[PDB]
Each structure stands twice: as C-alpha cells, then as structure tokens.
C-alpha cells in the first residue's frame with residue numbers, strides 16, 4: 001500500500017470540533033479531544049489507510065507510528081497483526097467486522113466492540129466508534145475512529 005500523507009498534517013482539532021458539533025448524531029460520544037486514542041483514516045485512498053494516529057492510540061496498541069500509518073486498522077484483529085482483506089478472522093466476530101465494513105461504506109456512524117490485539121499479542125476488547133468526517137470540500141473524506149480498551 002503506498003498511502004500518501006497530507007503535507008502539513010491533518011486538522012484533527014478541527015475535525016474533533018466538527019464531530020462534537022454535528023447536527024444529527026446517531027451515537028453519543030460526549031466530549032472528545034486529542035488525549036484519547038483515535039485514528040483518522042482516508043476514505044479516498046486504497047483500503048482506507050490510517051493517516052493519523054494519536055499517541056494514546058499508539059500507547060494502547062503498543063504499535064509505533066511507523067507501524068500503523070498507511071495501514072488499514074484491521075491489523076489489530078490478529079495477535080500477529082496479519083489480517084488480509086475479505087479473510088475470515090479466527091478471533092473476531094464476522095458479523096462485527098461486516099457491521100464496521102457496511103457502516104464505513106455508507107458513511108454511517110457506528111459503534112462496536114471488537115476483539116483486538118496489542119503489538120505484544122495481548123488480547124483486549126476495543127470499544128470502537130467511527131464517525132465520518134468532512135474535509136474542506138464539504139464532502140466526507142475521512143473517518144475518525146475512537147478506541148477504548150474495555
């Protein structure tokens with residue numbers, strides 16, 4: 001995947017404000033900021049790659065920035081971090097993965113609990129919320145994910 005990163009970075013604060021200010025929230029997130037675990041994925045690049053990960057996300061998962069940037073978040077679904085698209089996961093609920101997938105395809109807010117694994121192989125339940133984000137053009141371009149170790 002040779003995902004390309006936005007020069008000058010991402011407007012994470014602007015998107016967090018946009019999220020808290022959204023008119024018809026389908027899921028209540030409550031106040032959020034950059035201190036929590038989050039990632040921003042580019043819906044317009046091949047396989048919706050992570051283009052930004054907050055430090056709390058890297059800390060929670062045990063992975064470094066170099067290891068998560070440019071990858072579809074699904075790698076967390078395997079203790080070895082090897083998860084091929086369309087593959088039947090052996091540790092994660094298929095309906096769950098399908099739910100995330102359709103929500104993402106439809107720019108629909110979604111919230112799920114998904115089994116994930118940290119870099120050292122430690123299993124945990126990830127309480128995940130994905131909210132589509134509009135960039136400067138006004139159209140949905142990114143998705144912001146909020147991860148919470150349950």
Ligand SMILES: Cc1cc2nc3c(=O)[nH]c(=O)nc-3n(C[C@H](O)[C@H](O)[C@H](O)COP(=O)(O)OP(=O)(O)OC[C@H]3O[C@@H](n4cnc5c(N)ncnc54)[C@H](O)[C@@H]3O)c2cc1C
Pocket residue numbers: 039040041048072073074076077084085086087088089094095097098100101104114115116126128130143144145146147
């Ligand atoms: C911003 C953002 C943050 C994210 N953060 C995380 C995170 O922290 N942790 C995490 O684990 N994921 C996270 N994800 C999710 C991950 O990136 C994928 O989006 C998710 O795994 C679903 O998409 P996929 O491409 O993996 O689907 P696929 O690889 O296509 O897998 C879908 C699975 O569902 C099953 N399935 C499909 N259709 C049906 C059907 N009709 N009936 C029954 N079963 C069916 C299949 O058998 C398949 O194994 C995040 C996504 C975004 C956009």
